[PDB]
């Protein structure tokens, strides 16, 4: 309703860097809000693309941002009669970023790895890696849970069980309130997908540079399966956290698996031991149900609700024709231990190929009426096809079915405006929570400031 679409703030990265692919708000130890931005095609030292991360201080006028520097050099370690190898070319550093406390986590999901032993090897594969930074202190750490030192032959001989070589750890990421990093790794276990969790404190305290393979003992990874419903499911394509079992001393995980069960798609709600509490199935195959997931209480009863995006959902139209427009599904959490039911509300896109539901961002309470609100991206939506973000306000029965406000991309065609979104943080300290929108195709981020309702 009350985001200001007249006076925006723009931040810009280098041409071709894909600045804005991922973003998040970052509070320093003093509570000053900045914006961390991922730019996964930023050029590294060898003029190869490796990705980069930027830490943008808040300024109404916007502009350019300083880099948050991470080590971009390939590494080699000869140890235990093996040669360990990291490969950072085209790794996509900044394909995800998330901030928690005064720490920033930025991931390179396509970072490759190999282990050589005489004439054999593990195979050069995208295990992914995450980089952690405490900007104020300069501390750095890394987390790469899928790295191994098993040779190719052993997986073949063991029928490719526990195969974490193609994890792409960090493809999605989220941090629990208590400071546990949870990474989505959609290539895990031969493309089933997995989640890897470890406390941030333990990641820092257990990392040392140059070791490359090291134990984070407090970590927990999800499990492999022989159920072909899970095969090529990309479980971990998206991830979120919330409270869904009623016990406030446990955090639950929400995991998107957009190609689950032969491309039907699913989202699952799990406890922290990776035991499934609920499963929501997609409605239409190939719709990519689970592409995006969001958790927020939209109806003011104190119980978290779930929003799921299916950006390629084809709506039924006249004369038995289908139109790809995208769809968002709201599931309100009921009282007690019961199942999440049928969706409470279906929101559906209007512009063909708009990909409505590609990103869904909790906004907090934008209009300050007591109910939390959301923003849904259609990165190729709008009448012009340039991209749109739609705001939906919460209310006692869920969300309103018609948007309160629509933000048309200020960038040219192809910008992917809305592909990344973050809200619920007041960046200018005016008492209303604001929205940041990435447009990686234009290498820019737009900040929308919330203002008093008119």
């Amino acid at each position, epitope marked *: 309703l009350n985001l200001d679409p007249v006076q925006l703030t723009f931040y810009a990265g280098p041409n071709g860097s894909q600045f804005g692919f991922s973003l998040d708000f970052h509070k320093d130890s003093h509570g000053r809000v900045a914006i961390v931005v991922g730019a996964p095609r930023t050029l590294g030292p060898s003029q190869e693309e490796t990705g980069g991360v930027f830490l943008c201080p808040w300024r109404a006028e916007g502009g350019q941002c300083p880099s948050l520097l991470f080590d971009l050099r390939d590494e080699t370690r000869n*140890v235990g009669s093996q040669t360990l190898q990291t490969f950072k070319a085209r790794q996509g550093l900044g394909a995800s970023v998330v901030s928690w406390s005064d720490v920033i986590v930025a991931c390179a999901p396509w970072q490759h790895w190999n282990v050589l032993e005489k004439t054999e090897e593990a195979e050069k594969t995208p295990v992914g890696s995450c980089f952690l930074a405490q900007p104020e202190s300069g501390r750095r750490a890394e987390y790469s849970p899928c790295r191994g*030192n098993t040779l190719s032959r052993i997986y073949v001989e063991n029928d490719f069980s526990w195969d974490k070589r193609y994890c792409e750890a960090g493809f999605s990421s989220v941090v629990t309130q208590a400071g546990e990093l949870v990474l989505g790794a959609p290539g895990g276990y031969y493309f089933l997908g997995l989640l890897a969790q470890a406390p941030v404190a333990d990641i820092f305290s257990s990392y040392r540079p140059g*070791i490359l*393979l*090291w*134990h984070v003992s407090s970590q927990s990874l999800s499990f492999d399966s022989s159920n072909p419903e899970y095969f090529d499911g990309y479980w971990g394509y998206s991830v979120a956290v919330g409270e869904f079992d009623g016990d406030l001393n446990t955090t639950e995980y929400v995991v998107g698996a957009p190609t689950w069960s032969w491309t039907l798609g699913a989202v699952e709600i799990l406890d922290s031991y990776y035991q499934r509490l609920h499963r929501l199935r997609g409605e239409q195959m190939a719709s990519y149900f689970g592409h995006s997931v969001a958790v927020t209480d939209v109806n003011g009863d104190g119980r978290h609700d779930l929003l799921v995006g299916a950006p390629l959902y084809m709506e039924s139209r006249a004369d038995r024709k289908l139109a790809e427009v995208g769809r968002v599904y709201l599931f309100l959490q009921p009282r007690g231990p019961h199942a999440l039911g049928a969706p409470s509300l279906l929101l559906t896109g209007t512009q063909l190929y708009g990909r409505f539901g590609s990103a869904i961002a909790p906004l907090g309470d934008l209009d300050r009426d007591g109910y939390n609100d959301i923003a849904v991206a259609a990165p190729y939506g709008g009448p012009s096809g340039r991209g749109q973000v739609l705001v939906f306000l919460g209310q006692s029965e869920g969300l309103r079915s018609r948007p309160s406000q629509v933000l048309d991309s200020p960038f040219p065609t192809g910008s992917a405006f809305g592909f990344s979104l973050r809200g619920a943080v007041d960046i200018d300290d005016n008492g209303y929570p604001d929205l940041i929108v990435g447009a990686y195709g234009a290498n820019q981020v737009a900040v929308y400031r919330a203002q008093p309702v008119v």
Partner: antibody, heavy 119, light 108 residues
């Protein structure tokens, strides 16, 4: 708190076999490699071999091939060193070892099991 | 196999000294070395891994340095607990191999 708890002093005859145990306290034995190390007063410290208890795969110094056999049971959170066809030269103190952080390191040690071979 | 030549086999020193124990490998081991401590009639405790990294719990008066084939464990300001046996171990290659050890004894 990580602690490797080994079996007591063994006292066996030449030609006999013996199976020493190393039980993990405060952690899961599958977490890291577990190594066995032989100590004598004169010859000093010698690496026997290692096992990954998660999968049971082992490596040995070729000096100990035949003699020593390392196994593990994740159920009982325990690793074992069996020594066969015992002789005077096998009289030593045996330690189980695991790394702290580095996959390949040798940081945490059990208290040692003393073996004596005599008639 | 890689030979680890540890020197000196012993030294008679006093409380408060800075002393150094060196270890020489037969080839380069790119810092894949650990340092170990065995107190009298006791088991072993890890001091250093990967050349320079203190094991959790170890005091900073212990420090590791070196590169290539030549490494050092330095102990600043000797404590009474530091009179003990020390060994290097390399893990650049299987089989892992150890130094012959160094005993710190009391000067008088």
């Amino acid at each position: 708190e990580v602690q490797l708890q080994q079996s007591g002093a063994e006292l066996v005859k030449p030609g006999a076999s013996v199976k020493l145990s190393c039980t993990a306290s405060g952690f899961n034995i599958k977490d890291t490699y577990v190594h066995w190390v032989k100590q004598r007063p004169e010859q000093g410290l010698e690496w026997i071999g290692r096992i990954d208890p998660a999968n049971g795969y082992t490596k040995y110094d070729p000096k100990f091939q035949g003699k020593a056999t390392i196994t593990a049971d994740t159920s009982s959170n325990t690793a074992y060193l069996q020594l066969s066809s015992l002789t005077s030269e096998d009289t030593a103190v045996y330690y189980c070892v695991r790394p702290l952080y580095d996959y390949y390191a040798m940081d945490y040690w059990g208290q040692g099991t003393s073996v004596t071979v005599s008639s | 196999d890689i030979l680890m030549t540890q020197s000196p086999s012993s030294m008679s020193v006093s409380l408060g000294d800075t002393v150094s124990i060196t270890c020489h490998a037969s080839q380069g081991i790119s810092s894949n070395i650990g340092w170990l401590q065995q107190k009298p009639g006791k088991s072993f405790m890890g001091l250093i891994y990967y050349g320079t990294n203190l094991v959790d719990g170890v005091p900073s008066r212990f420090s590791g340095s070196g590169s290539g084939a030549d490494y050092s464990l330095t102990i600043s300001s000797l404590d009474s607990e530091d009179f003990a046996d020390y060994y290097c171990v390399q893990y650049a290659q299987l089989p892992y191999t150890f130094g012959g050890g160094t005993k710190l004894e009391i000067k008088r």
